[PDB]
Amino acid sequence: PGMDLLCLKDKLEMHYFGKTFDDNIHIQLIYQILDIEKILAVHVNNIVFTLDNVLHPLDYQTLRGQTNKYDRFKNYIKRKELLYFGEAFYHENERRYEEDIFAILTLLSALAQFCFAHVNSFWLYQLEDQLSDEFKETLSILWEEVTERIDSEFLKTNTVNLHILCHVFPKESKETIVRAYYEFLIKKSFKNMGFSIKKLREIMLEQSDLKSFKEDKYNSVRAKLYKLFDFIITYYYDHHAFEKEALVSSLRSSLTEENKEEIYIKTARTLASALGADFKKAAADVNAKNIRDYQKKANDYRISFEDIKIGNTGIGYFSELIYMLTLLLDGKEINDLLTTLINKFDNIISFIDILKKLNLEFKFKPEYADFFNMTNCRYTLEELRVINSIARMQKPSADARKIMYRDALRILGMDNRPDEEIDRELERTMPVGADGKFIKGKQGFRNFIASNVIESSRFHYLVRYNNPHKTRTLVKNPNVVKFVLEGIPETQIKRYFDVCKGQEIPPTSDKSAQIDVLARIISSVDYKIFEDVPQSNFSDALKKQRYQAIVSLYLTVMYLITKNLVYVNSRYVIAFHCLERDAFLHGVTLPKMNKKIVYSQLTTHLLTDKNYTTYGHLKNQKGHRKWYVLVKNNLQNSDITAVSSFANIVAAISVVRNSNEYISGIGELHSYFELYHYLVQSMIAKNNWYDTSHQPKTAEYLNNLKKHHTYCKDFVKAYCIPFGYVVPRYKNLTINELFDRNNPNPEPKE
RNA sequence: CAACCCCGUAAAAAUACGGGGUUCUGAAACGCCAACGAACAUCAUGACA
RNA sequence: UGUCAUGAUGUUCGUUGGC
Ligand SMILES: [Mg+2]
């Protein structure tokens, strides 16, 4: 009854609750808790790799006494390429203190050690009683800065509906009206209620008096109209309170679905008849003239609203760690992490509510209850939501631009050359003149590079992840260029062919010719072409647009490859994290042989377990015997050395680093999966990380790889055998057709 | 696109095929991705006391 | 050096398409 295929229901329930339950809601909740750590580990590993790539290799009192770790710290912190991370270590164009940077690095190391599983297994869930006094101060200072910032930025953006909401409520404090509207959209008091007000207003919208807001001419404003009726309702219930409670009891005591609608039906018609006049009065204020006039005056409101804000309120310590992680990333990664966390915590809240509804045990163990309950989860969900809602410009400072210039010219030519030549070209290109000034009327290269490479997120991603010394080789191999261009859809390909046409090519609508010419023009690009940017005649505009397009395409091509390789490696990191996690639950320790780790022992152990054989993924029954036989056959073709090497490769993210030594000999590309596995197989073959004495079938795999210049499916099936205990995961991670969910190709016939 | 469990007709094998489930299986779907759009902050251009 | 026009760059919202 509700048992899982992995046969860890009892173990998981005992670990998290303490006893076994005969129902199917507890594990339903536990999977979200298990989901949080996966994404946290992925992003922490990415951050650690970034720190390693950009910077080539008791309390604070003990640090000075060591005299050796002190030397490591003094030089590691002073390295000037800390400027590549925006606010991690520099504040107001000034360096942060050594204690704060030490605190940030130590917290990152502790989080990495926690996720990749000395710190206890309960570290993240108990920060009040484990964190030292020094780190808490640094987190507090960071949150003080950001809370001053959010106080500033809030009042400026949404000061168009704020005026109307303050106006519609004469008998209310200026502070109070702002309080609830921050309680409304920045952090949702909308969501945390048993009504579906979105559906409710639709039922109100079914009432006659307010069809007068459904006119076609009102299409100019919808979002700034839909929300306004939304906020009034969540303010209408707050004042009445008892009526809100009355509707709670009536719905909870309602019988059937027909009873649900009728309760909604009569409630809505009372609502329109109650305060419909406010809806008409509010909805009559929106127009082009009023909106423009309201935007003109943006300092008529002066509200601090500091006290109950978590900036001054005792914000949780778990959210400050998330903000510290956020400091060291870009927009997409932050959005991914925050969205996943909000979804998971919302699901946890809903599930615990469901458990309480049926009068069932819902308290966790004493170790976990301090964090996992209704109130603390609600608070931490609100904190994560407010962390997500921060506007960032991330302009590349004003001092860091010099190293930016150096690396920016290093990518566009001048690969692996001494800095003296770089400085010489810097001086000869854009002169200074006398007194360290800038030659007016003769500086156009600085503007082009600064506004097209320096201030681009793609360049920051490449600098964080790719070495500027050896980045040019990613575009030298034609096949990779054609594959990446073919991945890009049709419309912007057509736009790029049009803009960067030239004068010696005839118009063609064929996409193959377009890809060919784009590959040809992107193969040979140098800094010397960019030496004639028009200073300050349609030819000048056309030339400027063509230069913008050609510099954009290059970085796009590099960035796509880097991102997709990181993404595949993160998918494999999830797999190893889950494997290490599941090894502890099942109690099967991983011993060492010849200074290695045998990652293939979990599947061997589960191959000979009666309970797993009878009620698990690997089944030995008449009619259900595919994967048992296939896994048993594939287990006999695994190299322990190769598996250990693969584990190290994915742990260190070596595919992104050493991609310049093996991307020059690939035959043909059809998916990023085969590129990734060709790179890893080439690295393993060149490093001689195999043993033919213990397994003589690796020689044929290497020979096939050499004679075909493409990855061998048998080898990827070989070094992924530790994933044998989950059949869907093995299928997804070893079969190309099932790795990507955007490919409708069926599974190949065997 | 794949796995898992029920109810059907033939069958004993590495069982096909026809209906309904699954957050209690793995794939970012409360997500990515483009082009039209509205505000906003940036950088470069002409009119002036 | 503020203002008015004039074009580029990136976010943030919503429509419309595609995964
Ligand atoms: Mg799941």
Coordinates of N, CA and C in Angstrom, one line a residue, chain A residues 443-579:
Chain A
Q443 N 38.7 58.4 -30.5 CA 38.5 57.2 -29.6 C 37.2 56.5 -30.0
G444 N 37.3 55.5 -30.9 CA 36.1 54.7 -31.3 C 36.2 53.3 -31.0
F445 N 37.4 52.8 -30.8 CA 37.6 51.3 -30.5 C 37.2 51.0 -29.1
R446 N 37.5 51.9 -28.2 CA 37.1 51.8 -26.8 C 35.6 51.7 -26.7
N447 N 34.9 52.6 -27.4 CA 33.5 52.6 -27.3 C 32.9 51.3 -27.8
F448 N 33.4 50.9 -29.0 CA 32.8 49.6 -29.6 C 33.1 48.4 -28.7
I449 N 34.3 48.2 -28.2 CA 34.6 47.1 -27.3 C 33.8 47.2 -26.0
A450 N 33.7 48.4 -25.4 CA 33.0 48.6 -24.2 C 31.6 48.3 -24.3
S451 N 30.9 48.8 -25.3 CA 29.5 48.7 -25.5 C 29.0 47.4 -26.1
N452 N 29.9 46.6 -26.7 CA 29.5 45.4 -27.3 C 30.1 44.1 -26.7
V453 N 31.2 44.2 -26.0 CA 31.8 43.0 -25.4 C 31.8 43.1 -23.9
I454 N 32.3 44.3 -23.5 CA 32.6 44.5 -22.1 C 31.3 44.4 -21.2
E455 N 30.2 45.0 -21.6 CA 29.0 45.1 -20.9 C 28.0 44.0 -21.3
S456 N 28.5 42.9 -21.8 CA 27.6 41.8 -22.2 C 27.7 40.6 -21.3
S457 N 26.5 40.0 -21.0 CA 26.5 38.9 -20.1 C 27.2 37.7 -20.7
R458 N 27.2 37.6 -22.0 CA 27.9 36.5 -22.6 C 29.4 36.5 -22.3
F459 N 30.0 37.7 -22.4 CA 31.4 37.9 -22.1 C 31.7 37.5 -20.6
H460 N 30.8 37.9 -19.7 CA 31.0 37.6 -18.3 C 31.0 36.1 -18.1
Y461 N 30.0 35.4 -18.8 CA 29.9 33.9 -18.7 C 31.2 33.3 -19.2
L462 N 31.7 33.8 -20.4 CA 32.9 33.2 -20.9 C 34.1 33.4 -20.0
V463 N 34.2 34.6 -19.4 CA 35.4 34.9 -18.6 C 35.3 34.0 -17.3
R464 N 34.1 33.9 -16.7 CA 34.0 33.0 -15.6 C 34.3 31.6 -15.8
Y465 N 33.8 31.1 -17.0 CA 33.9 29.7 -17.3 C 35.0 29.2 -18.2
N466 N 35.4 30.1 -19.2 CA 36.3 29.8 -20.2 C 37.6 30.6 -20.0
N467 N 38.7 29.9 -20.3 CA 40.0 30.6 -20.2 C 40.3 31.5 -21.4
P468 N 40.5 32.8 -21.2 CA 40.8 33.7 -22.4 C 42.0 33.3 -23.2
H469 N 43.0 32.6 -22.6 CA 44.1 32.2 -23.3 C 43.8 31.3 -24.5
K470 N 42.9 30.3 -24.2 CA 42.7 29.2 -25.2 C 41.2 29.1 -25.6
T471 N 40.6 30.2 -25.9 CA 39.2 30.1 -26.2 C 38.9 30.1 -27.7
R472 N 39.9 30.5 -28.5 CA 39.7 30.7 -30.0 C 39.4 29.3 -30.7
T473 N 39.9 28.2 -30.1 CA 39.8 26.9 -30.7 C 38.4 26.4 -30.8
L474 N 37.4 27.0 -30.1 CA 36.1 26.5 -30.1 C 35.3 26.8 -31.4
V475 N 35.9 27.6 -32.3 CA 35.3 28.0 -33.6 C 36.1 27.6 -34.8
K476 N 37.3 27.0 -34.5 CA 38.2 26.5 -35.6 C 37.7 25.3 -36.3
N477 N 37.0 24.4 -35.6 CA 36.5 23.1 -36.2 C 35.2 23.4 -36.8
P478 N 35.0 23.2 -38.1 CA 33.8 23.6 -38.8 C 32.5 22.8 -38.3
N479 N 32.7 21.5 -38.0 CA 31.5 20.8 -37.7 C 30.7 21.3 -36.5
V480 N 31.5 21.7 -35.4 CA 30.9 22.2 -34.3 C 30.1 23.5 -34.6
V481 N 30.7 24.3 -35.5 CA 30.1 25.6 -35.9 C 28.8 25.3 -36.6
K482 N 28.8 24.4 -37.5 CA 27.6 24.1 -38.3 C 26.5 23.5 -37.3
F483 N 26.9 22.7 -36.4 CA 25.9 22.1 -35.5 C 25.3 23.2 -34.6
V484 N 26.1 24.1 -34.0 CA 25.6 25.1 -33.1 C 24.7 26.1 -33.9
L485 N 25.1 26.4 -35.1 CA 24.3 27.3 -35.9 C 23.0 26.6 -36.3
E486 N 23.0 25.3 -36.6 CA 21.7 24.6 -37.0 C 20.8 24.5 -35.8
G487 N 21.4 24.5 -34.6 CA 20.5 24.5 -33.4 C 19.7 25.8 -33.3
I488 N 20.3 26.9 -33.7 CA 19.6 28.3 -33.6 C 18.5 28.3 -34.6
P489 N 17.3 28.7 -34.2 CA 16.1 28.6 -35.2 C 16.3 29.5 -36.4
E490 N 15.2 29.5 -37.2 CA 15.4 30.1 -38.6 C 15.4 31.6 -38.6
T491 N 14.6 32.3 -37.8 CA 14.4 33.7 -38.0 C 15.6 34.5 -37.8
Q492 N 16.3 34.3 -36.7 CA 17.5 35.1 -36.4 C 18.6 34.7 -37.3
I493 N 18.7 33.5 -37.8 CA 19.6 33.1 -38.8 C 19.4 33.9 -40.1
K494 N 18.1 34.1 -40.5 CA 17.8 34.9 -41.6 C 18.2 36.4 -41.4
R495 N 17.9 36.9 -40.2 CA 18.3 38.2 -39.9 C 19.8 38.4 -39.9
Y496 N 20.6 37.5 -39.4 CA 22.0 37.6 -39.4 C 22.6 37.5 -40.8
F497 N 22.0 36.6 -41.6 CA 22.5 36.6 -43.0 C 22.2 37.9 -43.7
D498 N 21.0 38.5 -43.5 CA 20.7 39.8 -44.1 C 21.7 40.9 -43.6
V499 N 21.9 41.0 -42.3 CA 22.6 42.2 -41.8 C 24.1 42.1 -42.2
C500 N 24.7 40.9 -42.0 CA 26.1 40.7 -42.3 C 26.4 40.1 -43.7
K501 N 25.6 40.6 -44.7 CA 25.6 40.0 -46.0 C 27.0 40.2 -46.6
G502 N 27.4 41.4 -46.8 CA 28.6 41.7 -47.6 C 28.2 42.2 -49.0
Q503 N 29.1 42.0 -50.0 CA 28.8 42.5 -51.3 C 29.1 41.5 -52.4
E504 N 29.6 40.3 -52.1 CA 30.1 39.4 -53.1 C 29.3 38.1 -53.0
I505 N 28.1 38.1 -52.4 CA 27.3 36.9 -52.2 C 25.9 37.2 -52.8
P506 N 25.2 36.3 -53.6 CA 23.9 36.6 -54.1 C 22.8 36.2 -53.1
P507 N 21.7 36.9 -53.1 CA 20.6 36.5 -52.2 C 20.3 35.0 -52.3
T508 N 20.2 34.4 -51.2 CA 19.8 33.0 -51.1 C 18.8 32.7 -50.0
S509 N 17.7 32.0 -50.3 CA 16.8 31.6 -49.3 C 17.1 30.2 -48.7
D510 N 18.1 29.5 -49.3 CA 18.5 28.2 -48.8 C 19.2 28.3 -47.4
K511 N 18.7 27.5 -46.4 CA 19.3 27.6 -45.1 C 20.7 27.0 -45.1
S512 N 20.9 26.0 -45.9 CA 22.3 25.3 -45.9 C 23.3 26.3 -46.3
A513 N 23.1 27.1 -47.4 CA 24.0 28.1 -47.8 C 24.2 29.2 -46.8
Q514 N 23.1 29.6 -46.1 CA 23.2 30.5 -45.0 C 24.2 30.1 -43.9
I515 N 24.0 28.8 -43.5 CA 24.8 28.3 -42.5 C 26.3 28.2 -42.9
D516 N 26.5 27.8 -44.2 CA 27.8 27.7 -44.7 C 28.5 29.0 -44.7
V517 N 27.9 30.1 -45.2 CA 28.5 31.4 -45.3 C 28.8 31.9 -43.9
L518 N 27.8 31.7 -42.9 CA 28.0 32.1 -41.6 C 29.2 31.4 -40.9
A519 N 29.3 30.1 -41.2 CA 30.5 29.4 -40.6 C 31.8 29.9 -41.2
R520 N 31.8 30.2 -42.5 CA 33.0 30.8 -43.2 C 33.4 32.1 -42.6
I521 N 32.4 33.0 -42.4 CA 32.8 34.3 -41.9 C 33.1 34.3 -40.4
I522 N 32.6 33.3 -39.7 CA 32.9 33.2 -38.2 C 34.2 32.5 -38.0
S523 N 34.6 31.7 -39.0 CA 35.9 30.9 -38.8 C 37.1 31.9 -38.7
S524 N 37.1 32.9 -39.5 CA 38.2 33.8 -39.7 C 37.8 35.2 -39.2
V525 N 38.0 35.5 -37.9 CA 37.7 36.8 -37.3 C 39.0 37.3 -36.5
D526 N 39.3 38.5 -36.7 CA 40.5 39.1 -36.0 C 40.1 40.5 -35.4
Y527 N 41.0 41.0 -34.5 CA 40.8 42.3 -34.0 C 41.1 43.4 -35.0
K528 N 41.9 43.1 -36.0 CA 42.3 44.2 -36.9 C 41.2 44.7 -37.8
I529 N 40.1 43.8 -38.0 CA 39.0 44.3 -38.8 C 38.2 45.4 -38.0
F530 N 38.2 45.3 -36.7 CA 37.5 46.2 -35.8 C 38.2 47.5 -35.6
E531 N 39.3 47.8 -36.4 CA 40.1 49.0 -36.2 C 39.5 50.2 -36.9
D532 N 38.4 50.1 -37.7 CA 37.9 51.2 -38.5 C 36.4 51.5 -38.1
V533 N 36.1 51.4 -36.8 CA 34.8 51.8 -36.3 C 34.5 53.2 -36.6
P534 N 33.4 53.6 -37.3 CA 33.1 55.0 -37.6 C 33.1 55.9 -36.3
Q535 N 33.9 56.9 -36.3 CA 33.9 57.8 -35.1 C 32.7 58.7 -35.1
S536 N 32.0 58.7 -33.9 CA 30.8 59.5 -33.8 C 29.7 59.1 -34.8
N537 N 25.3 59.7 -44.8 CA 26.2 58.6 -45.0 C 25.6 57.3 -44.4
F538 N 24.8 56.6 -45.1 CA 24.3 55.3 -44.7 C 25.3 54.2 -44.6
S539 N 26.5 54.4 -45.2 CA 27.5 53.4 -45.2 C 28.0 53.2 -43.8
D540 N 28.2 54.3 -43.0 CA 28.6 54.3 -41.6 C 27.7 53.4 -40.8
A541 N 26.4 53.7 -40.9 CA 25.4 53.0 -40.1 C 25.4 51.5 -40.5
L542 N 25.4 51.2 -41.8 CA 25.4 49.8 -42.2 C 26.7 49.1 -41.7
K543 N 27.8 49.7 -41.8 CA 29.1 49.1 -41.3 C 29.0 48.9 -39.8
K544 N 28.4 49.9 -39.0 CA 28.3 49.7 -37.6 C 27.4 48.5 -37.2
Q545 N 26.3 48.4 -38.0 CA 25.3 47.3 -37.7 C 26.0 46.0 -38.0
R546 N 26.7 45.9 -39.1 CA 27.4 44.7 -39.5 C 28.4 44.3 -38.5
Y547 N 29.2 45.2 -37.9 CA 30.2 44.9 -36.9 C 29.5 44.5 -35.6
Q548 N 28.4 45.1 -35.3 CA 27.6 44.6 -34.1 C 27.2 43.2 -34.2
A549 N 26.6 42.9 -35.4 CA 26.2 41.5 -35.7 C 27.3 40.5 -35.6
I550 N 28.4 40.8 -36.2 CA 29.5 39.9 -36.3 C 30.1 39.6 -34.9
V551 N 30.2 40.7 -34.1 CA 30.7 40.4 -32.7 C 29.7 39.7 -31.9
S552 N 28.4 39.9 -32.1 CA 27.4 39.2 -31.3 C 27.4 37.7 -31.6
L553 N 27.4 37.4 -32.9 CA 27.3 36.0 -33.3 C 28.5 35.1 -32.7
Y554 N 29.7 35.7 -32.7 CA 30.9 35.0 -32.2 C 30.6 34.6 -30.7
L555 N 30.3 35.5 -29.9 CA 30.1 35.3 -28.5 C 28.9 34.3 -28.3
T556 N 27.8 34.5 -29.1 CA 26.7 33.6 -29.0 C 27.1 32.1 -29.3
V557 N 27.9 31.9 -30.3 CA 28.4 30.6 -30.6 C 29.2 30.0 -29.5
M558 N 30.1 30.8 -28.9 CA 30.9 30.2 -27.8 C 30.1 30.0 -26.6
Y559 N 29.1 30.9 -26.3 CA 28.4 30.8 -25.0 C 27.4 29.6 -25.1
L560 N 26.8 29.3 -26.2 CA 25.9 28.2 -26.3 C 26.7 26.9 -26.0
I561 N 27.9 26.7 -26.5 CA 28.6 25.5 -26.3 C 29.0 25.4 -24.8
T562 N 29.5 26.5 -24.2 CA 29.9 26.4 -22.8 C 28.7 26.1 -21.9
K563 N 27.6 26.8 -22.1 CA 26.4 26.6 -21.3 C 25.9 25.1 -21.4
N564 N 25.8 24.6 -22.6 CA 25.3 23.3 -22.8 C 26.2 22.2 -22.2
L565 N 27.5 22.4 -22.3 CA 28.4 21.4 -21.7 C 28.2 21.5 -20.2
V566 N 28.1 22.7 -19.6 CA 27.9 22.8 -18.2 C 26.6 22.1 -17.8
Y567 N 25.6 22.3 -18.6 CA 24.2 21.7 -18.3 C 24.3 20.2 -18.3
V568 N 24.9 19.6 -19.3 CA 25.0 18.1 -19.3 C 25.8 17.7 -18.1
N569 N 26.9 18.4 -17.7 CA 27.7 17.9 -16.6 C 26.9 18.1 -15.3
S570 N 26.1 19.1 -15.2 CA 25.2 19.2 -14.0 C 24.2 18.1 -13.9
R571 N 23.7 17.7 -15.1 CA 22.8 16.5 -15.0 C 23.5 15.3 -14.5
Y572 N 24.8 15.1 -14.9 CA 25.5 13.9 -14.3 C 25.9 14.1 -12.9
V573 N 26.1 15.4 -12.5 CA 26.4 15.7 -11.0 C 25.2 15.3 -10.2
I574 N 24.0 15.6 -10.7 CA 22.8 15.2 -10.0 C 22.8 13.7 -9.8
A575 N 23.2 12.9 -10.8 CA 23.2 11.5 -10.7 C 24.2 11.0 -9.6
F576 N 25.4 11.5 -9.6 CA 26.3 11.1 -8.6 C 25.9 11.6 -7.2
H577 N 25.3 12.7 -7.1 CA 24.8 13.2 -5.8 C 23.8 12.2 -5.3
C578 N 22.8 11.8 -6.1 CA 21.8 10.9 -5.7 C 22.4 9.6 -5.4
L579 N 23.4 9.1 -6.1 CA 24.0 7.8 -5.8 C 24.7 7.8 -4.5

